[PDB]
Amino acid sequence: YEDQVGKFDWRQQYVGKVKFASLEFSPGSKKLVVATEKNVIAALNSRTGEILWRHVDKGTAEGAVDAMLLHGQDVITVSNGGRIMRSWETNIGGLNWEITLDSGSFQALGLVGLQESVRYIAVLKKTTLALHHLSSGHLKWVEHLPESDSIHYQMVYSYGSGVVWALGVVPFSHVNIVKFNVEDGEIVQQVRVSTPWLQHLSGACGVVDEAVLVCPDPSSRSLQTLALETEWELRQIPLQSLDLEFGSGFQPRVLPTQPNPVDASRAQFFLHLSPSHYALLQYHYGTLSLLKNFPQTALVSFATTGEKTVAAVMACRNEVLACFNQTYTINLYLVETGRRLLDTTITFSLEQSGTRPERLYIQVFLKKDDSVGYRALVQTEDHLLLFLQQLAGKVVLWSREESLAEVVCLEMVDLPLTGAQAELEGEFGKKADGLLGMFLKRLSSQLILLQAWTSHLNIDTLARDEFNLQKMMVMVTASGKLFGIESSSGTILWKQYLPNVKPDSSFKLMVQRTTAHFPHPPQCTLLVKDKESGMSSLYVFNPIFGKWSQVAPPVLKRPILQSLLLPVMDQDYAKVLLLIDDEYKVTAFPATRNVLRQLHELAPSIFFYLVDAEQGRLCGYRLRKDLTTELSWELTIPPEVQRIVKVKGKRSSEHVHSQGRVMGDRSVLYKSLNPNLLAVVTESTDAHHERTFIGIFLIDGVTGRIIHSSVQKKAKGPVHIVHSENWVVYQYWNTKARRNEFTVLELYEGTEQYNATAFSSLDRPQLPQVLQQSYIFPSSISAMEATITERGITSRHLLIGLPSGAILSLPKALLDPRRPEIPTEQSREENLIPYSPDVQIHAERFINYNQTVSRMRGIYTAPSGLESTCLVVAYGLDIYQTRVYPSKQFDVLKDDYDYVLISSVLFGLVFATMITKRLAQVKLLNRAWR
């Protein structure tokens, strides 16, 4: 904190992919109300695209938004499968009423009107229909529609007639319609018709004009119609008379409109015949006419300015499927007549390739000259929001990368060396035989530097900072998107897209070669694996510029299971990467001749461990000379009583400064630094509150020996474990007392180390002793990761991620298990605080002040330069970046240095020395002469 807000940290607020959106608002209200797939309901500023009020919800499906509607100034939402219905005041940014509903799957949401004004909400579930007041949400009336145990209701209609229309279907069979009255709710009427060809109503059918039902029938290439006010039997009209046809193997759709719920729908409507094909049809008293046909058009949208309806149609400039250059034009068409608007065409270009727009919501208004001026919010396929305004300058208003809402994995890559430092790595290494040559090159470099000094009298120029405190984050997003974000300013430097990436695919990002090899480009590898198919692929890219490297990745024919980043490097300083396939063969990368020789000579020292959680099995495989694996060790935690939930092993890129610790007494206690120690944490499959338990095994990674096999009784997940140099810390829930608890496991060897020259997992016959202690954490948790420094000199801190959004910096020294229950002289010599079961969450410890990170998912800690600053990236819904100083920034000049005092004392004391020298000389002369 230290009240240096905004100097180093930066937060970005991201909502998810926009599932439902609402643009209709007052022209001066300048608001968008959008609910996303991330369970988030938010308001976006129209002018600049920023969050006004955001309300996150439960991460699970128990809070998913299912339907949005807007009326007047408050937006009405349904969540948890129709369980809760809420009304949000868009101006203030809070609820107006929250009402729970009865069981039954929600199917359709709509409004009703009495005579001229909308005042109630009709919400329909698979077995019932309900009416709720707008003012307070009090239930008006609930009616169980007849025979509903067999039918599936799909839509609800009402208008100023003061009646309610309900429609239900049975697949490939008859459909039914019910007339209710708003005043009472009793079943005014009920009709049934036969629709053998119909499949479902919501996706396919629609209703236009005066409640006229319209189902497009592809079996006969026609438009089945039902004048629902009076007609009792469906009528048929072929599209051949209108010169129209349906596609093959596709479900045509129909898009009606309703400018306000009280008035009847517009007669004109859209028909989606086939993809990239639309029609405008105007029904008029038993017959329909084609208004305008739109071929090769991706998306259409509707809007109302108050009196007239406006249709927006999207298509690229020239088709080349796909599109020529990702340049899409949107044109306005009047709904009264299928005539294109004048000087309303908009044209924009999507930066990426292979991405096409998916959603289009337009907002219209009256210009000064009464011309319909419109803006368009378009969501692309890769979860990107574009706001397009009519005027040519800055055709995109605010481009929002909502994709970064769900980040799976990220790594920090150091920036390239600056120009002023590039030559310091080129002159070195010459190793000239004669000293004269060395002197010549040294003096030449000196003259070059002198000339550069005397001369002093954006991704293009990206350069490393002096402290190496400014890195660039390569981020991977489950939407399949790769980002490069500068860690200092938070801006985006490069974006890339991976085509055809399933939402549930598992990623793994590895930094194969950093920037300390200037003649060679930095190179990172991302490993994606589709869950459904099982096939995995490798994408290698430069993490600085973002372009795919020319080094073609190998084609992984078989599904793979695990990957390793061996510290051995090729001649071009690329860290060898190993993959284990399903046939337990091993594929190397880059797998050159030198790499193959190096890892063949070092083959028997490479071990994989695969943890199959489905069967509750752990296996550990060797590495033979000919790149093959053999069953070295195998353990089985029986899935019938225990399922493996976490396999957190210690980070490979860390160092430990003090091998042992001073115990006082003038003696030393040696830590058990085992680098191959897994920390497999499993939950009890018995979910009962009194018999549940959580096990933690400190399984070795090479010999398979179980160092520790702790089982905590009366506890339940979720469990968040961090594994570090020596200790492990796993937070869990305690069902018996209802309180979150920590449990620190510290591994200590004897008073004398078994071996100091080297550590081998095959030569550790002494089981390290374990020290345990359980503390109480007075809140929940969402993500943990220890702060890591380059040399490990700086003390260790745990970045507790609370649900509130703060990031508590809990000192690891507090969680010491050696804190005695009764203080003694030994403890005072070691300065150990007496054991206190309560751990405080004092608000002054938060590494962030009020930039809360809602629904925190993970904390990444990077060593950075220096020794007191660790870079922190908390990723979740929001993404936040900062630096932490666990040791109060011991190696950096304080920001409150008194320059005007030190310089003043220096230059007022040199003058004092001169004055006192003159005084001493004068006094000496006077004393000599007297």
Binding site: F890, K894, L909, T916, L919, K923
Partner: protein, 225 residues
Amino acid sequence: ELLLDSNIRLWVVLPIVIITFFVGMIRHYVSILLQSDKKLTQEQVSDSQVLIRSRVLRENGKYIPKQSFLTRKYYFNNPEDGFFKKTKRDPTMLTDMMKGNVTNVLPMILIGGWINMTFSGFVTTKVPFPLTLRFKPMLQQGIELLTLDASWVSSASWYFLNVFGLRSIYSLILGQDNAADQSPADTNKAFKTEWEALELTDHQWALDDVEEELMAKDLHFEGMF
């Protein structure tokens, strides 16, 4: 190693050295300015010079014949002659001398304390030899680190090392036996001890054998030009 901030050199390393150097110069010049010779009356300087003459006589009376020496003895310590027999006789001065003695070290310790406050929380320089861990609490004042190598030192102890290692430089530039560093009242008893000592002294006329030790070698005469 440690990637120490470069700005720690331009403002915590060099300024400490400059402060120590010029504070030593200031202290020496203030010391010479403050020193004032105490007023002495005729009797004290007279007796001090008399005992000076007595001591130099005791030291090198060997170049004086025996009769002159024993006449000196009669004059100095003998009832009949009378000399050495009929020759005898919060305060401001104590506070002043105590303050003068105090001002030779205490200003250095006060400067050290001021430096320790002003430059607290840094790591200034690495002492190039492996100091013991038990010396940690005083070398690394203001640092919360635990596993840090003992060879890393904070600002206060670096200033102390500077003030210890700069006295020789002071003697080099300021002048020999300078006052910038870190580190008779009664005549009656003096009269009596001179009496007893010169009673105990003997005579050895060094001229008893000068001729024979001169006759042995010829007189040096070259370089007359």
